[PDB]
Amino acid sequence: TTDQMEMFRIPVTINAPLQQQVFGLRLQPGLDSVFKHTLLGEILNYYAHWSGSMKLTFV
Amino acid sequence: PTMNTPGSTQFLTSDDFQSPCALPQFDVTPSMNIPGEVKNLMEIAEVDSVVPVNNVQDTTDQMEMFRIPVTINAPLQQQVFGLRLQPGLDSVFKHTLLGEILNYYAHWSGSMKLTFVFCGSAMATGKFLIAYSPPGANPPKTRKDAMLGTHIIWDIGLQSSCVLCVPWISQTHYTSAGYVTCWYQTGMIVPPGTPNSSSIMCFASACNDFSVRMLRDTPFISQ
Amino acid sequence: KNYHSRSESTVENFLGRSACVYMEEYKTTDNDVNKKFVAWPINTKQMVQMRRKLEMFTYLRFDMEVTFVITSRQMPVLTHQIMYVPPGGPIPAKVDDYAWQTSTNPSIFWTEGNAPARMSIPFISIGNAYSNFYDGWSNFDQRGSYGYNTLNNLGHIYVRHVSGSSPHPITSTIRVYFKPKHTRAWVPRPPRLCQYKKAFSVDFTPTPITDTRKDINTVT
Amino acid sequence: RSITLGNSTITTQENVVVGYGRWPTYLRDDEDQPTQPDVATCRFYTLDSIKWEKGSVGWWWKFPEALSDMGLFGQNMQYHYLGRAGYTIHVQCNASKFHQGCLLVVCVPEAEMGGAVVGQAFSATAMANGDKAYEFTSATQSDQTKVQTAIHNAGMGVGVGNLTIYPHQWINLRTNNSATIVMPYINSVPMDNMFRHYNFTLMVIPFVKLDYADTASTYVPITVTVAPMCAEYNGLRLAQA
Amino acid sequence: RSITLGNSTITTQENVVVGYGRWPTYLRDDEDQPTQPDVATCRFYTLDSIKWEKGSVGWWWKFPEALSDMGLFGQNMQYHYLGRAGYTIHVQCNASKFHQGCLLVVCVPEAEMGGAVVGQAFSATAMANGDKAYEFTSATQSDQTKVQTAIHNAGMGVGVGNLTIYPHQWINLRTNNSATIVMPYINSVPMDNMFRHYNFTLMVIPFVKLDYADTASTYVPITVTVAPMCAEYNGLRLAQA
8 A cells, every 4th residue: 555545445447347346345343454443443442342233335 | 338448547637527525514605796707808808908009129218109109390291100900919919908818819810999099289180091901902102002092081180089990800820911000191280389299099909709719828928 | 142232331431440540669768859759740641541541532521539559668657648739839849848738738647557548639720621632832922832731730649758757768659540530521532543652742653544454355 | 506695795605514513602692701792703704725736635724823814803813812703614616527526624623733753842833824724745744843744644643534523524526515614612711812722723635636537627726715703802991880 | 316126135216118008916816726926036136237339239138038047036947837927127228428329128028039041940048048148240140050130120030120019118328218118927828837938038229329429438338127026936735635
């Protein structure tokens, strides 16, 4: 990773096959590296038991 | 469900606990209604006190500190006196009644009252410009500058007491402080057979209410 | 596992925990007057963990309580003067001076073999809440200290060993525990993401946002 | 369509994100300490127009130092001592439909920023200096007398993705083009000196870089319009006997 | 705006052309021969995305062989013997305003297609073979084992202009971009084996070739979404004494 501001950008381009994968995620907002340091991640790591539902918006 | 909890087996030197009476079965002499009972230390500070405005570098005697000099000969634009309102650190108000009460506290705010009484001949007349500068403002350097601000034209002929209630008096522990200045406007005019000097005395009080918070020892009399 | 609900996430019982904040030793007899008593400005920016928790809020209003655990090693009972100088009080500069005899400094006298000494300092400050962060200057010429105000200041605790004419050659060790009570907090703030480098500054060195993985599509 | 706002200057525009659900309001809604509300202060003090180029990183303006040289407001800061004010900030950019980019308009209350070199001090001219849009930079800053200015940590060491706590509005060029953030007065003392303390800092951060295709304007002008609302000061006159 | 249709998958879109004014309906709306309606079959089985290139001729998908490998529907065709179903077909393409083209989305019931060489037979792999969009070709076909595939006669010998009899919808790129054709079950026997008989054939025919100007995407992706509605089968359990 060349710079740290391209981490928030998932790339989409004109040229790419019609069956190709854009991204993958594993929902585990307390141990998965993606969600580890987000707001949700930080609050969760101060506890040892937690459960519920999360919301993912893709803009 | 216990009284052996941590922090309840010590002398805290500010206990409000009740203690055994050394000699019970002793009758005390009942209180008498003596004049002038005191209920606050604030009552003391609400009594007017002569402030020593004049306190020049070379002072011959200590009774001329309460006299601001006013004379026949002096230009029409000249300054009479200057003050910096900060009744807890300014040298003028340091040892007055108001000063003494304030120095036993570490936080205080309110308003004070300054009365200027001309003690002089009964035949003198003139005008003065008692001018007030807000906390942030610089003291005026000329009478013209002073006149633009807040000013009272005190006529010595028709009045002999000018009472100025001043707000925004706070602890401020350079410093933002108000200023009270006074300027000649006409000079002193007298008829034949009258002295060529007079004086102005000054008083200070704690006005309607003040509030003092947190005890502290005085930095005056040393142990 | 099952769902249910919570009430362990309330602000009061989040930040309200007893935690060690200072530990120091002193010897009653030696050649250094500095080491004959303990000084300790009260602040909550020394224990890194405790700091991080409190810094998720900008304004805080609380009245703390301080418990001391004192032990001593080498004969008769030994007493400790645990004085509290509040902001703008006189501070002792040496063991035995008039600043110890000041009657406006709340001073516990605790002797060993009894349950720990404790007192609860109230909410001191002329402001309406302590402010963790301050984005200003000490003067309006703006040439003074940066990020420091005097309205978040707290007093000092000075501990000395009450001794006779000639002290013993004892040595003692103190530990201080600190716990907020009746906490209220206003304005939330993002968590820290850098390692602290100063105990009063907000200084940091840049660090990567998050750990890397092989490929965007790769997840295991 | 166009709800033309007038005060003493006109701004034609066409959501409001209130700071915390609190509108600016006088302290009188709650002698010794009289106050003097100045009701002539409000009006749209439009700041300079920054150019959003393709290779840009971000921008910040310290308040209320940005309006220190702006008309009546500027004058009152010099005269008066204690004063409190709330602000209505309209950040509008103008771009076509062949331009793609994203901005995070965020008002951060009390942001203390660390120095570029750890354990060094910097002057007040390194954070604010009238109306200037100070520029965040990519990578580290090694100039001793500068602020840290690393975009990814927002110059505070907090991580740039988490700035969404603070009252923020996203200007996605795809759809909307305007952000209105009504910041109320937030401080721990009723009113304070307006030179010593920088109350809040407005940051505009491009999260997606501008791509303009070919033979189109190479910059998108971002204009900031600040109107101080409900500004109160301290009285300058004596009380009655 | 967007009437989000949900079943067990979601398809966001925004007229319905009913086959002959008859909606799909159960045979029960009219022991020895019990039936078993499967109500879990419906959901949007989105097929592959064909690319509409400039030099293309047309495409066709045999039903119900296109959904022979698609989930539950596919399984039931293997298990059960006799079954009947109706279909809701959503053919949507996505194109800009600098692209020009015309398509004829037509559902043709029972289309028998002649061989490329007259008086020859061809295999079942020449018409259908799972989900594939078989391609019509310009001119004649001389490959013996292929279908005739001449676009102008539609591979049936009927003339391509007259295919407007059958339930059809025109996707003119100028205006609209979606075609919804609700095909009911049409057969001369109540229910039939779903391997032997290809009930209807969906054909998409470009009547105007795509012209995309210059430096724009060179294909327009046409996606076909089929939801089997009101599918009934035969019981697999014994009757009472």
